[PDB]
A paper describes a structure:
Next, we determined the cryo-EM structure of helical [name]-7 tubes in the presence of CHMP1–3 and DNA at a resolution of 3.6 Å. We were able to determine the structure of 36 nm PspA-like rods at a global resolution of 3.6 Å and a local resolution ranging from 3.0 Å at the inner rod wall to 6.0 Å at the outer tube wall. The rods are arranged by helical symmetry with 1.05 Å rise and 173.9° rotation. Thus we, relied on the strong density to build a model for Loki [name]-7 α1–5 into the density, while no density was found for helices α0 and α6. CHMP1-3 is, therefore, not a regular member of the symmetric rod assemblies while it may be part of the curved filaments, involved in nucleation or occasionally bound to the rod assemblies. The structured elements of [name]-7 adopt the canonical [name]-III fold: α1–3 form an extended hairpin, connected to α4 via a short linker (E117-P120 Fig. 5B, inset). Helix α4 is separated in two parts by a short loop at G146 and connected to α5 by an extended linker (I154-E159). The monomers are arranged in a j + 4 repeat, where α5 of chain j packs perpendicularly against the tip of the hairpin of j + 4, forming the typical [name]-III assembly motif known from IST1/CHMP1B. In the assembly, helices α1-4 make up the wall of the rods, while α5 together with the tip of the α1 + 2 hairpin forms the spikes on the outside of the wall. In [name]-7 rods of Asgard, α5 only interacts with a single hairpin at the bottom end, which is a common feature in eukaryotic [name]-III assemblies, while in bacteria top and bottom ends of α5 are interacting with two hairpins connecting two layers of the assembly (bottom). Therefore, the Loki [name]-7 assembly more closely resembles the bacterial configuration with the characteristic spike, while the Loki [name]-7 monomer adopts a conformation closer to previously determined eukaryotic structures including the α1/2-α5 interaction motif.
Residue numbers in the entry:
A (entry chain U), B (entry chain U): 110 to 164
Write the structure that this text describes.
């Protein structure tokens, strides 16, 4: 049985499946930040001073 | 009967099956330490000093 555990807790496979998860994690989180990319448009198209009179 | 015990308590086989177990044991235990490999990422990506103000 130690052989059968060591077949499938193989450190050759533990390290594979751990590395794969990390790449997908940074792929998804950065794909959330470009999903919030529009602040760069909002801060750009509106620069309106005039309301300092309104202030 | 001593012959039949000595056929299957053969020291040629006792020493084989004892050596095989030890290799699988170190294979599995080290495959547990690479299963805890992520502390190296946690200690790396977060180094945030600023909270010393918050402290």
């Amino acid at each position: 049985e130690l052989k059968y555990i060591a077949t499938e807790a193989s450190p050759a496979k533990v390290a594979e499946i751990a590395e794969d998860s990390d790449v997908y994690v940074s792929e998804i989180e950065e794909a959330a930040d470009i999903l919030a990319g529009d602040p760069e448009i909002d801060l750009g198209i509106d620069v309106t001073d005039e309301l300092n009179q309104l202030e």
